[PDB]
Amino acid sequence: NPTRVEEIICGLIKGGAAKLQIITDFDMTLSRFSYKGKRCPTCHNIIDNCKLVTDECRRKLLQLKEKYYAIEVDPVLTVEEKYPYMVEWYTKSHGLLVQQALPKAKLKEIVAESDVMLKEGYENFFDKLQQHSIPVFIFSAGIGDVLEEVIRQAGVYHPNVKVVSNFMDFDETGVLKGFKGELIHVFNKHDGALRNTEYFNQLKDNSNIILLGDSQGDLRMADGVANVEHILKIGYLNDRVDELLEKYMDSYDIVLVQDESLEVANSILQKIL
Ligand SMILES: [Mg+2]
Secondary structure, eight states, X not given: OHHHHHHHHHHHHHHTGGGEEEEEOOTTTTBOSEETTEEOOOHHHHHHTSTTSXXXXXXXXXXXXXXXXXXXXXXXXXXXHHHHHHHHHHHHHHHHHHHHTOBGGGHHHHHHTSOOOBOBTHHXXXXXXXXXTOOEEEEOSSOHHHHHHHHHHTTOOOTTEEEXXXXXXXXXXXXXXXXXXXXOOTTOHHHHHHTTHHHHHTTTTOOEEEEEESSSGGGGTTTTOSOOSEEEEEEEEOSSHHHHHHHHHTTSSEEEETOOBOHHHHHHHHHHO
């Protein structure tokens, strides 16, 4: 509904900066799906495709990423069933990264030399929010260390930006030994939201929320919010469009089909801040 949408936004404008927080995922939501007719990497793709991984390992990774993607997007498997294979996927991929023994100290370059790209209008996005100290919660199934390097180098890792994702654990050689915490993956963001109660309880007054996502999973990122009064959900539908469009229309407040900018969120922010 166009009217239900403006009712929500008017709630937002009314509350201003004092009541606003942002929740958002990273991959394909702050970062582009494609650019100049070529696909852009996900955090995981950044690592797969870099010079610190052998030809043979990347072949094993693609062999994986083909088998397990096929299962993720299976129309007949219920998500109940997909869950273990998603778990299985990440475990093997990370296992293959681990053996490669990647240096903590070499991330800076790797990100620098990838084709990673942020949606149009990100400076304006991140700079407006910092200027009004609007809490930003970035919740990602990707790789925290790379995510973080993408936004630091883009010059937008502001003090209001809390990043929560799958973070790497290293040994005393500054060389990868695995991953901290319980795994975040596409199907369990709810479980992850509730685990971040400390964060949200400090924002008891920030009761106006804009959620940004690009998957059906992303819809659950708000489940740990203390006070909800008004909430707007923006969905970036980049792929599997004809399959999922009626679904997105039915759950996100705004669907943006293959929209590689942040202009819609910026214009809403324009009206609020
Ligand atoms: Mg995503």
